[model samples]
Target: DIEQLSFARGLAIDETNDHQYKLTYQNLLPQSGKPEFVNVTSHGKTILEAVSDVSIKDPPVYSDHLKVILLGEKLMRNQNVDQVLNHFIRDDELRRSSYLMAARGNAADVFTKGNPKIMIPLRIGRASVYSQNGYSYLIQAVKNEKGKAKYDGAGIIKRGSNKLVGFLSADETQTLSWVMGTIQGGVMPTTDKGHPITFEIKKSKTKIKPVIENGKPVFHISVKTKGILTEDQNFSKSYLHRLENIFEKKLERDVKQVMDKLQHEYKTDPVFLSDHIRIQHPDYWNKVKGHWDEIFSETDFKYDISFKIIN
Candidate 1:
């Protein structure tokens, strides 16, 4: 039974030889029956050659409708990602809409298991892992010629062995969702009249500005959010005012926490803080390019979050 499928949703590469590699393609087989997986491995001096050999082994699998590509930890750490990416983009078969992701373990491992223990079922799909809810910036960076495209596969950088380095935690992820215009309906906890209340975000926008002074890079971020009261602990005029203040303070604290983690822990600057500096203060950025990392470590930032309660 030939299942009618549209495109390849994910790909992973593992190093099997000094020069050769094991390429795993996560094909989205039609759900006519049960989900199936196919694997192909090849040896070559480079990633492109290995991929070419795999295509020869299974010509039916390599289609023009490729949509997503993933990278294994071994390959990502060993090989220069930029070189591998050139191969994918050179081919007309792979679509631009295709996303890239970094696996927590081997790309094969992700396919071996249906879902991770910590992952929710609703978050199991490709979209959840690579879309607005996922890591969509990798695709955006690759497509942008004027900007720096730092990675080949998913653009996600891992930490030590078996650890994800550049992923946003749940709280950070929520902040990212808010900044990227992705979060539409979510509850933010606030305090009202010495009691707890909940507010729902109706709209939000965030912008980061990098500051360069004395040949050093600093970052400043601002978030503008608007929300409505969903649940009130005390339904009184005075209580409403107190709730608004609580909401502003809580939102500020949450946003600051996200920024602190990004600067101190991740150190990846996926938010394009550097880009912001380049655009806003090119002369200052150029002077501080050499010690930007150190300067960013001690940078000063302020967060402002304003909310409007619509009943």
Candidate 2:
């Protein structure tokens, strides 16, 4: 009976018709030699029902080895994200740390289109942890033109409703990380005198403080970072100071762009900026918590960025 066991490597969820749930499982077989994997799909009115449908074939499947859960864009964008994940939340077999991603299109395609030899879910975890270009929360996965699985940017989950509203680009994602001070030692490309240069950030710290002026909310955001000058090779103390100033300006500009988008376009706080207010100004936070996103959009932000190139 153990030989018949099918171990699930990942799960993908999408909408079926107008009212059904479609579930796909990437399964692995128990073996000594080169292991084999397969993709199985089923449909039902509910997630549990769809999962049960997998039992019609393939040993009822197992989620003990499940590594990723891909939620289709339609499912998250149109419906509430928490409701879709409720079934998995109670599943003891599924891993608590399983990577959750919002698929740009069909979630199933991420498993079937890519070269099977390359584990798509595994590669996603790798790319995210070591991603030098972008950052994400819950993360975003999509199939490129060549049918290769790629991490585009991040899925923006709305605060009050907890729905998928939109996404941030790679550049926006990186700038968001910079504003949040979550840099994980990556290269930032900038320009110096019309020449391309890269700054490799080694350390970073950010602070966001809430200030009330004229009975309104304003944020004081400060970023302190230390990095090394890379690429385009530069020397001389004067040149280093110029590069530092340029980096600061670039950082402020990029931060403003994303903040503006978050404030005006999305009107959401995907970065959890409200936490600063809650801890520092609980009274104000209580009044603003219900419509935090709306309040966030109307809030003013000031920036103080210090970038030191430490050789």
Candidate 3:
């Protein structure tokens, strides 16, 4: 029976229709291909109590191995997510690195549509809690009613309200990664001087300088990325100017596409724009630190991109 099992593997947390808590986890049975859901329903707080209250013919559930925590829309909208996270954080069994995700719609439905074996999001755990966690970058994840969840981009949640305010799609994440630094390696496909080719990244770097000059927030972003041509992988001589220029234009478009969202949509600094000011421009930060998101949403930036290729 389920009582024989010793570990709880996944977690799905969401609000009920009337604004209560609905917590769900799956118990895998030996015979069935699909795991059956065991859950607790409560009108309010006491998350651990609710979890413990759920029991069946099986042995008591053990939560020592919880891998994912998927938070639905209403739950995110109604409470301070990080505060609620403290509930799990203090618990000894729960891993601090386990992914904390935002569900685009219903958190419950995602469980059924997700990987039936794990019944959890694969983004898995965070790198570190005190530092920037890997799962933190993956707030924009969702799925269709019948499909598994897709990590399309980034989600922007306002700190004051703790609600999902904006989204960054796959392309936007790509642009932000390149210009803001952190993109490891990828392909930039283009036709260089009418020659169809792809540039496979070997080195990519971004330098951002933020300063308050002339009573204005002026920041310059420069990204330098180089790669080997996919079409000419055998070491061929090429016109560096022709290829770099084409990639620069493409990079400009990519940067603008994401910057438009950062400046117009959520204005929240996911790329550490406010973080830059906190250390460098402490005086300005003191004056406008509280509303930096609003300030960031309306700030203008200068862009410089350089692309190179090694034959």
Estimate every model's Cα lDDT from 0 to 1.
0.52, 0.69, 0.63
Regions of model 3 farther than 4 Å from truth: 1-63, 77-79, 84-90, 112-140, 144-146, 191-196, 232-238
Give the per-residue lDDT digits (tens) of candidate 2, residues 193-310. 7789888889999998889785678999999999988766436668778888898889899889998988899887766687788899999888877777778889999999988998
Q: 1-311, model 1: which lDDT tens digit per residue?
A: 86444454556677666555666555554333433534222222333334556565866744565565656656655654444555545556455455555553455544432334111111213332333221213211121122222222223332122123454444455555565445555777656555667788887777776655545555555666777776643266776667777877876677678667666875544443555677898777677665554555567676655566777
Candidate 2 segments whose C-alpha is farther than 4 A from its true place: 1-65, 87-90, 112-138
Candidate 1, residue 191: Cα displacement in angstroms equals 5.7
Kindly indicate the candidate among 1 and 3 with the higher TM-score: 3
TM-score of 3: 0.67
Q: In candidate 2, which residue pairs clash?
A: none
Ten-residue region with minimum lDDT total, candidate 3: 127-136
Say which prediction, candidate 1 or candidate 3, comes out ahead on lDDT.
3
In model 3, what lDDT does residue 236 have?
Answer: 25
Best by TM-score: 2
